[PDB]
């Protein structure tokens, strides 16, 4: 089965940039390579076929090049509607396979998260489990590490994280992390801390509470 490797996996870019993304199949595929665009929640759209031919209706700024095992897609100057994920797909042999996508996101200045911590509500505690929530609001770039501590014990395996789409107005991200504990464990321990590391911070920021205050 032909593996399609795209690079880079992600690229931060500005309106007007010239952007070139690459696709390398594990086997020669002549020129039988298509490129698609996909935005969140929508179906992919055909951009380029046969490595270099532009699908009708696609803006002239899109072009493609390549053969054998090296292919590129180039946007000669990015437009605001071009931030999306781009997929290559080989039509040389079954099963037909796709790359894992290159996502283009908007470059902007670094912005540190605002951090907030929320203890479990009394309502949830009455129902028998506890969720501690940590909010990282409006930061950039997307890379951020969230670390939970309970009585200075580092937690792993018992939290989940979720991240918003790049904001449409300020191009930041936000992140929610939820630490899950038994009600019994929550009441055995005192100090609950969320420690955030991010490039916009000179040193990690910790938000804490002590249970029952």
């Amino acid at each position: 089965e032909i593996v399609m490797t795209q690079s880079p996996s992600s690229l931060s870019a500005s309106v007007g940039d010239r952007v070139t993304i690459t696709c390398r199949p594990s086997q020669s595929i002549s020129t039988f390579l298509n490129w698609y665009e996909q935005k969140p929640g929508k179906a992919p759209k055909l951009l380029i076929y046969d490595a270099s031919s532009l699908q009708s209706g696609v803006p002239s700024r899109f072009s493609g090049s390549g053969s054998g095992t090296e292919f590129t897609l180039t946007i000669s100057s990015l437009q605001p509607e071009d931030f999306a994920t781009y997929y290559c797909q080989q039509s040389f042999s079954t099963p037909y396979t796709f790359g894992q996508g290159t996502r283009l996101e908007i470059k902007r200045t670094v912005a540190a998260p605002s951090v907030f911590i929320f203890p479990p509500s009394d309502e949830q505690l009455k129902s028998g489990t506890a969720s501690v929530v940590c909010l990282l609001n409006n930061f950039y770039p997307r890379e951020a590490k969230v670390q939970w501590k309970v009585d200075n014990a580092l937690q792993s395996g018992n939290s989940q994280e979720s991240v918003t789409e790049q904001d449409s107005k300020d191009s930041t991200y936000s992140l929610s992390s939820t630490l899950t504990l038994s009600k019994a464990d929550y009441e055995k321990h005192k100090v609950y801390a969320c420690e955030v590391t991010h490039q916009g911070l000179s040193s990690p920021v910790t938000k804490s509470f002590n249970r029952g205050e």
Partner: protein, 216 residues
């Protein structure tokens, strides 16, 4: 022309699902069609190809024993039926039209795609959320919308009057098989004593609506 697929489906492991894709008379007679699926946050997996004229098919080895693609020309509709479902079959399923072009290889040119249909496969049962407060120059507050199934849930604030500074996060799927999401909003700390904040949660799959007032 436009490829219109049927709506979202929720199924238990071991069941089967049948997704439709409505095209036109010209389209069914002039093109082959494929089905391609995309699991959440994942890439694409090709499933196979059908010739609506006579219904000849060819399936990916991974799905050969439990996918059946058929067409009904009287209704200009293509169908994909996937059997013996398991949770990893949770995905958005797409029908795609195949433009003739790749003569040498016989490969596809996915010219036109349906909008997709979400299929969730889980042993979980329908269940409305519990909504818990995330209680408070800027202050943050929110709602934890916990333990519901299936997707989706909508959250608004003050019946739509409060939109600035709102973030409703994508849900996470918990070990239990139930989903959980948070919706937060940042507001001026000075408004906490005076301004009322309600999150409006609607989980149509269980016909559950909840308004939760969030206070310091």
């Amino acid at each position: 022309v436009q490829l219109v697929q049927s709506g979202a489906e929720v199924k238990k492991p071991g069941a089967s699902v049948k997704v439709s894709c409505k095209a036109s008379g010209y389209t069914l007679t002039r093109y082959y069609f494929h089905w391609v699926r995309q699991a959440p946050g994942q890439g694409f997996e090709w499933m196979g190809i059908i010739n609506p004229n006579g219904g000849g098919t060819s399936y990916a080895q991974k799905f050969g024993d439990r996918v059946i693609m058929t067409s009904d020309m009287s209704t200009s509709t293509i169908y994909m039926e996937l059997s013996s479902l398991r949770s990893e079959d949770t995905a958005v399923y797409y029908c795609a039209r195949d433009m003739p072009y790749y003569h040498d290889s016989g490969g596809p040119l996915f010219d036109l795609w349906g909008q997709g249909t979400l299929v969730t496969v889980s042993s979980a049962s329908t269940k409305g959320p519990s909504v818990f407060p995330l209680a408070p120059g800027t202050a943050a507050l929110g709602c934890l919308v916990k333990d519901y199934f299936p997707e989706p849930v909508t959250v608004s604030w003050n019946s739509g009057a409060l939109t600035s500074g709102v973030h409703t996060f994508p849900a996470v799927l918990q070990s239990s098989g139930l989903y959980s999401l948070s919706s937060v909003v940042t507001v001026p700390s000075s408004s906490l004593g005076t301004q009322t904040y309600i999150c409006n949660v609607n989980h149509k799959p269980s016909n559950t609506k909840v308004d939760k007032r969030v206070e310091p």
